[PDB]
Amino acid sequence: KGQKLFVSVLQRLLSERGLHVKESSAIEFYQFLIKVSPWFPEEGGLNLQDWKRVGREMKRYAAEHGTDSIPKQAYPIWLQLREILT
Amino acid sequence: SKGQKLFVSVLQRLLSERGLHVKESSAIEFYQFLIKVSPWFPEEGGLNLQDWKRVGREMKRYAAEHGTDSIPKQAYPIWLQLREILT
Structure with a gap:
């Protein structure tokens, strides 16, 4: 949840x-x-360290799975939140 | 945690x-x-005015049942500041 x-x-x-x-x-x-x-949800927070980790783990997911089933809004939202946290 | x-x-x-x-x-x-x-x-609630108003009612239900003592001093002040932000 x-x-x-x-x-x-x-x-x-x-x-x-x-x-x-x-x-x-x-x-x-x-x-x-x-x-x-x-x-x-369990261990992370809204902080740049965790959010960059989330991003590495996504861009790994993109290499290992292709653009298919990755929502079109995911990267743009991840990126906006990275900038907010900078 | x-x-x-x-x-x-x-x-x-x-x-x-x-x-x-x-x-x-x-x-x-x-x-x-x-x-x-x-x-x-944690499961059902959002940082929104209705959910948050429910939280304060429930903090006051706790204050009624177990008395003012052993309620953190920062609890009502933080709750109140976030209530305002949610407006």
């Missing part, structure tokens, strides 16, 4: 910068997030 | 931006208090 919490946080952080995502797009981002990085 | 480091990181960031700073260990105590009073929150 933590889906509701994380989504509520994401949408706040993004709308603060004028970007808006569908509720269902944010949910699918999060479902994707915890698949690639299952430790994240 | 599961879901902790995440919630704690959101809390510190949100307060930071309003010029408020809270020690990590005070924020950790706040969180452990929160899930004790509202164990639904």
